[PDB]
Amino acid sequence: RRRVIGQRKILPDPKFGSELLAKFVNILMVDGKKSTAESIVYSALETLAQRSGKSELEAFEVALENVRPTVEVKSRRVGGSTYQVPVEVRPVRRNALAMRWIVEAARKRGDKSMALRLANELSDAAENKGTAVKKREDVHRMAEANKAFA
Template sequence: MRRRRAEKRKIIADPIYNDELITKLVNRIMLDGQKSKAQKIVYGALEILQEKTGENAVEAFHKAIENVKPLVEVRSRRIGGATYQVPFEVPERRALSLSLRWIVTSARSKQGKSMIDRLSQELLDAYNGVGAAVKRKDDVHKMADANKAFAHYRW
């Protein structure tokens, strides 16, 4: 018998923009519990994003996240000794966490410059529909499209 599902924790909105998604980004950036350092990075990146887009920082950030969110992904499913990559629709929570993860990892993998500059550049790229995180989403979509013949193996 399985245990009960873990309950979802309530995320407290961040103090400056009053947005839960920004808090999630701060928590994703944070290393070794250094939250104030992570907040400086995120807020600095959002200011740069606001300057470059000319749009409200929170709206630009939300648009960037929307551009990175995957709609479908593939999961391995073993059927009769063969493993198939079966396409599945991505639940909203997972799509959000994947998009944040992809943005942060692609910002971290860039060379040179400060983390503020790298994160703001990645958010700007995502806002414009280009960049590493958006490419990652497109790759996931292509993989799901290539394997749509196995969609009937969904459970």
């Protein structure tokens, strides 16, 4: 509320030396599994280079521009009455929700193993598909059309 907290300071990628990639493994952690994620997501990310066939240090974002969010519903029951009131995305969520848009359909897809199942969906965004993509298709509908109540 009235008080605020700063963003927790994060060391960079232990392998590529980039803090943005280090934050990425931190969201997929269920059951406390980064060492398994070492054989799951780190084994996934290592394969993401040659499958993409280019340097995944700064070309890593060539599939993320469409994913850029602009609005989400903020529940302001102002005066005791819930409203739509979609506030524009501030930087502490517009990038967090980008990672929240990744593995929603990548647990039990019925494939070899999610050691490389996630290594299927990533190039799909710069191959024009995958989970992160259609996330922005539904956001445009809830805003920009209800001006009488938005």
